[PDB]
């Protein structure tokens, strides 16, 4: 009965339904999502679908004339009324410059450099999100991840005891896996891996699914020097930081995601029923695994979602498509609604 | 050298090999893995000038011809790579295990290459069908090696 | 007779007269110098004097409007016929974008990022200098040295067997010293120090002065492990590269610039008559020494000058004054005329 409604496409539909429910609860208010890639073709082609679906309220960035010309040439009539904002022409541009200079005065950014930086749409979008002018931002559709996420980490920052991480959802036919940091940290330590696992567990728990973390490696409970030792230590630290969870490591991917292999080979492990949160030892493994699963595997992956930052702020992979942008914007609108509701409870 | 061995194995099956040196960056050549993969691609191209070897790149860029053509038309790899070389052990191991488990595509292996005689090691988490496939390919490699030895 | 006419009172005048003579011998064509900071008060204030002295022909960068408004506010009547160009609206903007995408495609920049980078005034000025549309460029008066010089090295680059390196002239009453390098290299090795010494010697010999090189250190011919050994090796390498030169090291700062101390304590050294070019171990030593000599010393310094680049491109220090800017632009005009003459002769 209930086992025949797995999150293949029901996951994104349920996310859209939850976005609509949250909007209806808060007086029919659509979260304002800033797109610094105003002139990007894929961004606008996904924005047409998003505004048709009544998900978010776009705020494009750039010169209004060029953005309007691009919209007209690309034949999108739904985007004829969008708050196109020029970063330099905004009334609050100087306040944003002053705030950025005050944040990073002792980090190589004085008034002149801050004024130069705030002309960059990424920095202005980060300031809009941080200063409450918007609820979230979506960037990185036309630039690499590093230079598109650096403004977010420099401006919005990360909350206390929080490490930024790239979280991906692999929606299989019956259960959805969560891939841990895929975008930010090169070689996270044991404590960093434990924190990433805790953030992923929180995100999974937001969706009503019990999280079962697994620290991936190339060895099955070997504890050898290097990656296996780091993953075993990270599992121990995560268990210490959250003793009510099913965290186990180290292990291989098949052992983690297959209950039968783990039960037959390693019955001593505390991970029962398979893992839905997978944490990777480094950046190469996570990135390559998630991209390969996206391309050659028929399972649909969505992301990467930036976690650990104070406010809602997302970076699309430059390799994405229109559907990927739509899914990422839906989930960033959901996260922005959650953060706005949490901020309005104090 | 790993790319050359994999290219020989692919050519044994009558398929033109297209080699991609995977990374987390797209032709960035930055410090760390991207520079190592760029140098590896250059060395492999030098060793076998007639091959289609490119790097560094990401997995989706490598295995999707449309993505590579749309984003990076300067690259010398066209039609999508069929040989993938991973920066380290963790990446390759985790990727192949995850593709085997959660994907719907069959994965056969791992096959030990670079050894003088045919000798394969099965993963401890294998199934009966996996052992059957591995033994079939081990028999193929053993016959090839025996024929090569007899020819000499 | 020659004692009463020293560098500290005649050097800048001789440089200006050489600019005038080179312009006259080439048909009265001033060098086209592109200024990325079109809306900088110091840049415009020095440009007034430069146009009055017909040293160069300025090409300001930025939107023609804000630059014109700044000129009107600062009340410079001469800077009304000057060329103000917008990087995005130039007729050759897309050719520059294609060139940058072609020469940096495998270094992390594609068309989507090349178009964004060419919007920056620094990158546009560097590309203009590289493609021959401007003779040289003078930037860095509003931002720090690193971000001002990064586009220069990325676009213009270095010539064969060349290394980027700062170069400052300390004009004393009787002679002028040449400190190198003060801006780029954090901790150059022996080979890099020898190459910097060779470049400094070439620049000194351009001014009709025999160069005497000294590899500065904290030890006097000690050869101890660390910096002294590095400078001893660098002096040996530089001597091998240019046998006809007078290169000595390692030595302290006072031994190098005082012939009496050298002739009294270490007569064996091959440096006789005092050094006029000084090579420093690391960046901290050279930067601090030149800035302290500029501030608390009574000897005027001019620079820093970016040597080792294919084309003429200088970066001012952000803590400069109008006189520093005009001196640097004069010497940039000299270097640009030399580069243009060498390119035309080929
Ligand atoms: C989907 C895809 O395409 S994934 C692509 C693969 N991923 C990548 O290419 C990016 C890999 N990651 C990176 O390069 C780095 O994590 C980047 C993006 C942060 C580079 O920025 P860096 O050079 O490391 O740092 P930078 O000096 O610019 O500072 C950025 C800020 O991030 C913060 N930061 C970075 N990593 C962390 C971390 N793990 N924990 C906490 N803070 C962090 C720094 O504290 C800094 O803030 P501060 O200036 O207030 O101190
Ligand atoms: C739903 C999903 O899919 S993901 C689910 C999980 N995601 C999460 O992000 C987890 C939830 N965590 C959070 O939302 C974050 O921890 C945040 C946003 C609450 C923390 O933001 P912070 O600014 O670090 O919160 P903090 O606890 O310091 O409170 C900020 C305080 O600064 C005060 N403040 C005053 N001026 C300002 C200002 N200009 N800006 C910010 N705060 C201000 C606020 O009043 C508040 O004090 P208060 O509690 O007395 O009202
Ligand atoms: C999918 C498929 O069907 S596989 C398709 C592709 N397959 C391949 O490319 C297979 C590659 N391998 C081979 O072809 C074979 O290993 C061969 C034919 C090259 C044999 O390798 P060889 O080293 O030539 O084997 P051979 O038995 O002739 O031994 C000669 C060398 O081995 C060395 N050797 C012999 N015994 C040993 C030993 N026990 N330990 C180490 N070296 C040894 C000898 O010293 C000699 O080296 P030398 O010539 O430098 O002095
Ligand atoms: C007066 C003053 O203000 S002095 C202030 C003190 N000085 C400073 O702070 C600047 C010191 N230097 C630095 O910080 C850096 O080394 C910089 C700015 C020169 C650039 O270093 P990075 O930012 O890591 O350089 P990046 O990776 O962007 O590469 C830029 C280019 O410079 C080149 N480069 C940098 N240093 C050198 C060098 N010593 N020799 C040759 N080439 C060099 C690189 O090869 C690269 O070219 P490529 O793109 O073709 O490979
Ligand atoms: C005055 C003072 O105070 S400083 C005095 C000391 N100064 C110096 O010593 C500066 C020395 N530097 C120089 O003379 C110059 O910068 C040079 C000669 C090193 C650079 O010249 P280059 O740009 O390398 O090339 P140049 O234009 O002279 O020669 C043409 C060649 O450039 C090649 N080239 C490559 N890229 C380019 C390009 N972007 N633009 C033009 N030519 C290019 C062409 O292929 C051509 O080669 P070819 O004729 O064999 O087919």
Give the pair of three-digit tokens for residue A334: 């959901």
Q: How far apart are CA A263 and CA A141, in angstroms?
A: 43
Say yes or no: CB of residue A106 within 6 Å of ligand 1: no
PDB experimental method: cryo-EM
Q: How far apart are CA C18 and CA B3, in angstroms?
A: 60
Q: What is the DSSP secondary-structure string of A4-54?
A: G--TTTHHHHHHHHHHHHHHHHTTTPPPEEEES-TT-HHHHHHHHHHHHHT
Could you say which DSSP state residue B76 is in?
A: S
What distance lies between CA A195 and its chain's CA centroid? Answer: 16
Distance (Å) from the alpha carbon of C130 to chain B's nearest alpha carbon: 22
Residues of B in contact with A318 (CB under 8 A): 26, 71
C-beta atoms of A142 and C108 within 8 A: no
Residue A278's Cβ-side half-sphere holds a number of Cα atoms within 13 Å equal to 33
For A172, A248, B110, the CA distances from B142, given in Å and listed in that order, are 39, 40, 16
Q: A292 with A135: CB under 8 angstroms?
A: no
Q: Whose CA is nearest to atom 4 of ligand 4?
A: C183
Q: Which of A162, A204, A310, A345 to mutate to test the pocket of ligand 2 (most atoms within 8 A of CB)?
A: A310
Chain A residues at the C interface, defined by Cβ less than 8 Å, are 108, 112-113, 116, 142-144, 147, 318
Ligand 2 centroid to residue A182 C-alpha, Å: 25
Report strand pairing: B52-57 vs B18-22: parallel
Report strand pairing: C312-315 vs C136-139: parallel
Q: Nearest to residue A251, comparing CAs of C312, B101, B63, C44?
A: B101
C-beta atoms of B102 and A177 within 8 A: yes
Report strand pairing: A300-307 vs A165-171: antiparallel
Q: Nearest to residue A61, comparing CAs of A28, A44, A39?
A: A39
Q: A84 with A47: CB under 8 angstroms?
A: no
Give the pair of three-digit tokens for residue A30: 């659509």
SS3 A308: coil
Distance (Å) from the alpha carbon of A143 to chain C's nearest alpha carbon: 6
C-beta atoms of C108 and B30 within 8 A: yes
SS3 A301: strand
Q: C96 with C118: CB under 8 angstroms?
A: yes
Q: Mutate which of B24, B27, B45 to disrupt the C interface (most C C-beta within 10 Å)?
A: B27
- A87: number of Cβ within 10 Å: 23
List own/partner pairs for A13-19 with CB under 8 A and 24 or more apart: A15/A330, A15/A331, A15/A334, A16/A53, A16/A55, A16/A330, A18/A334, A19/A55, A19/A330, A19/A333, A19/A334, A19/A337
Query: Residue by residue, what is the 3-state secondary structure of chain C?
Result: CHHHCCHHHHHHHHHHHHHHHHHHHCCCCCCEEEECCCCCHHHHHHHHHHHHCCCCEEEEECCCCHHHHHHHHHCCCCCCCCEEECCCCCCCHHHHHHHHHHHCHHHCCCHHHHHHHHHCHHHHHHHHHHHCCCCEEEECCCCCHHHHHHHHHHHCCECCCCCCECCEEEECCCCEEEEECCCCCCCCCHHHHHHHHHHHHHHHHHCCCCCEEEEECCCCCCCCCCHHHHHHHHHHHHHHHCCCCEEEEEECHHHHCCHHHHHHHCCCCCCCCCCCEEECCCHHHHHHHHHHHHHHCCCEEECCCCECECCEEEECCCCCCHHHHHHHHHHHHHHHHHHHHHHHHC
What distance lies between CA B80 and its chain's CA centroid? Answer: 13
Distance (Å) from the alpha carbon of B67 to chain C's nearest alpha carbon: 14
Report strand pairing: A176-179 vs A277-279: parallel
Ligand 4 centroid to residue C147 C-alpha, Å: 9
Ligand minimally distant from the alpha carbon of residue A22 = 2
**Phi, psi (5° rounding) for residue A30?**
-90, 130
Say yes or no: CB of residue C288 within 6 Å of ligand 4: no
Q: Resolution of the coordinates in A?
A: 3.2
Contacts (Cβ under 8 Å, ≥6 apart) of C154 = C104, C123, C126
SS3 B45: helix
Q: How far apart are CA C166 and CA A228, in angstroms?
A: 48
Contacts (Cβ under 8 Å, ≥6 apart) of A119 = A87, A88
C-beta atoms of B97 and A291 within 8 A: no
C-beta atoms of C107 and B71 within 8 A: no
**Where do runs of H (alpha helix) occur along chain A?**
10-25, 41-53, 64-74, 93-103, 111-117, 121-130, 145-155, 190-206, 227-241, 253-257, 259-265, 283-296, 322-343
- B80: number of Cβ within 10 Å: 17
Q: A169 with A11: CB under 8 angstroms?
A: yes
């Amino acid at each position: 009965l209930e086992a025949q409604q797995g999150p293949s496409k029901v996951f994104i539909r349920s996310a859209i339904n939850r976005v609509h429910q949250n909007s209806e609860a808060n007086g029919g208010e659509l979260p304002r999502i800033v797109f610094p890639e105003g002139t990007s073709t894929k961004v606008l082609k996904a924005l047409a679908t998003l505004v048709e679906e009544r998900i978010c309220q776009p705020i494009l960035l750039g010169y209004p004339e060029r953005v309007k010309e691009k919209i007209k040439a690309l034949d999108i009539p739904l985007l004829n009324d969008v708050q196109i904002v020029h970063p330099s022409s905004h009334p609050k541009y100087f306040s944003f410059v002053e705030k950025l200079y005050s944040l990073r005065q002792r980090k190589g950014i004085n008034l002149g450099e801050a004024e130069r930086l705030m002309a960059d749409p990424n920095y202005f979008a980060a300031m809009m999100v941080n200063m409450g002018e918007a609820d979230g931002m979506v960037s990185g559709s036309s630039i690499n991840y590093a230079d598109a996420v650096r403004p977010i980490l420099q401006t919005i920052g990360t909350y206390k005891e929080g490490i930024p991480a790239g979280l991906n959802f692999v929606l299989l036919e019956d259960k959805f896996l969560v891939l841990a940091d895929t975008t930010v940290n090169f070689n996270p330590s044991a404590e960093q891996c434990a924190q990433i696992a805790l953030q992923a567990a929180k995100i999974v728990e937001y969706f009503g699914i019990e999280p079962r973390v697994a620290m991936l490696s190339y060895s099955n409970f070997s504890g050898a020097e290097g990656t296996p030792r780091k993953m075993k230590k990270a599992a121990e630290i995560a268990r210490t930081l959250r003793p009510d969870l099913m965290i186990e490591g180290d292990m291989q991917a098949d052992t983690a995601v297959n209950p039968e292999i783990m039960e037959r080979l390693f019955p001593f492990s505390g991970l029962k029923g398979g893992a839905n949160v997978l944490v990777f030892p480094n950046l190469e493994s996570s990135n390559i695994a998630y991209k390969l699963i996206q391309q050659i595997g028929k399972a649909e992956v969505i992301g990467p979602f930036l976690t650990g930052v104070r406010r809602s702020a997302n970076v699309l992979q430059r390799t994405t498509t229109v559907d990927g942008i739509v899914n990422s914007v839906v989930f960033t609108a959901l996260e922005a609604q959650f953060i706005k509701d949490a901020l309005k409870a104090r």
